[PDB]
């Protein structure tokens, strides 16, 4: 029978304890040690403790159990501890924009879905490209990429595998790096909804014709990427698939891996 601190759980398996009533520090440390063992066995991750100024007598006890400072305001101090064996990343600032490209293949015709800007710089330059877009915060690569395809073409497509990825630095004035994943998706239909948005036009294009676009032969990187696409169309390329696994809290985590092995 254990003295558990009352805490509010969040959607990310964190617990936030808001202290209110005075408490003796050694009663606090007994309760906190037992609460931490309980939370760890329930697979909690971030543990947050809000201590008002009037409860400054508890700050040392929290720090002794492994809490560090997170922030403070005149009336309270917020402490945090990472109690999961996964990486502790609390202090890190976001460094990357994450994007994905979609190889959508009609397996009957070996044609791939492509788009072309109706403006600005790339009209009317006849550049036909794989659908691409950025992954929003709280979104998976696998759902995010499918969303992009249907927002552009109306086609619903299921994520199959990641074929390749790469980092790049896009431009001066944004000190952040872009990460791009080339994904293969399987379409549920083939009928493109004409003019889904004003920005883009879409069609099916034979894989060889996608590869042979002069823009796509311009440098080694484009040719390399396009060649990975063609080899996948030829069923000669094994990428990384998703495998759902259960975390200590019961939630599902998708692992991208060589699914065959693993």
Contact flag: residue 107 with a copy of itself (CB under 8 A) = no
Residue closer to a copy of itself (CB basis): 21 or 124: 124
Give the count of beta carbons closer than 10 Å to the beta carbon of residue 47: 26
148 is in an annotated binding site: yes
Please state the length of the chain.
Answer: 262
CA distance 248 to 15: 15
Q: Which of residues 148-177 bind a copy of itself (CB under 8 A)?
A: 163-177
CB of 191 to a copy of itself, least distance (A): 26
Contact flag: residue 30 with a copy of itself (CB under 8 A) = no
CA distance 191 to 202: 11
**x-marked contacts with a copy of itself along 240-259 as a string, rule CB under 8 A:** x--x-xxxx----xxxxxx-
Contact flag: residue 199 with a copy of itself (CB under 8 A) = no
Q: Peptide bond preceding 124: is omega within 30 degrees of 0, i.e. cis?
A: yes
Contact flag: residue 236 with a copy of itself (CB under 8 A) = yes
Q: Which residues contact 46 (CB under 8 A, 6 or more apart)?
A: 12, 13, 14, 15, 80, 81, 82, 83, 90
User: Of residues 17, 35, 45, 51, which one binds a copy of itself by CB under 8 A?
Assistant: 45
Q: Which of residues 48-67 bind a copy of itself (CB under 8 A)?
A: 48, 65-67
Local structure of 163: helix, strand or coil: strand
CA distance 36 to 24: 18
Residues 14, 46: contact at Cβ < 8 Å? yes
H helix runs in the chain, sequence order: 25-41, 59-64, 141-153, 207-212, 220-233
Residue closer to a copy of itself (CB basis): 68 or 188: 68
152 is in an annotated binding site: yes
Contact flag: residue 35 with a copy of itself (CB under 8 A) = no
CB of 91 to a copy of itself, least distance (A): 9
Annotated binding site for Mg(2+): 148, 152
Annotated binding site: 148, 152
């Amino acid at each position: 029978q254990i003295p558990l601190l009352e805490g509010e759980t969040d959607n990310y398996d964190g617990v936030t304890v808001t202290m209110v009533e005075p408490m003796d520090s050694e009663v606090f440390t007994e309760s906190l040690r037992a609460s931490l063992s309980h939370w760890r066995e329930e697979g909690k991750k971030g543990i947050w403790i809000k201590l008002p100024l009037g409860l400054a007598n508890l700050v040392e006890a929290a720090v002794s159990e492994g809490f560090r400072y997170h922030h403070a305001e005149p009336e309270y101090l917020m402490l945090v501890s990472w109690i999961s064996e996964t990486p502790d990343t609390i202090p890190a600032n976001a460094s990357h924009v994450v994007g994905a490209g979609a190889l959508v293949i009609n397996k009957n015709t070996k044609e791939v879905l492509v788009v072309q800007e109706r403006s600005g710089f790339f009209k009317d330059k006849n550049v036909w490209k794989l659908p691409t877009g950025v992954i929003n915060e709280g979104e998976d690569i696998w759902t995010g990429v499918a969303r992009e395809v249907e927002e552009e073409t109306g086609i619903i497509a299921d994520f199959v595998e990641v074929l390749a990825f790469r980092q790049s630095h896009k431009a001066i004035l944004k000190k952040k790096t872009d990460m791009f994943f080339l994904c293969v998706l399987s379409p549920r239909s083939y009928d493109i909804t004409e003019q889904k948005s004003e920005i883009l036009q879409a069609k099916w294009m034979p894989i060889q014709e996608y590869v042979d676009q002069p823009w796509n032969k311009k440098n080694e990187m484009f040719k390399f990427m396009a060649n990975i696409c063609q080899k996948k169309c030829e069923e000669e390329y094994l990428g990384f698939a998703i495998v759902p696994t259960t975390t200590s809290s019961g939630k599902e985590s998708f692992i991208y891996c060589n699914a065959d092995h693993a």
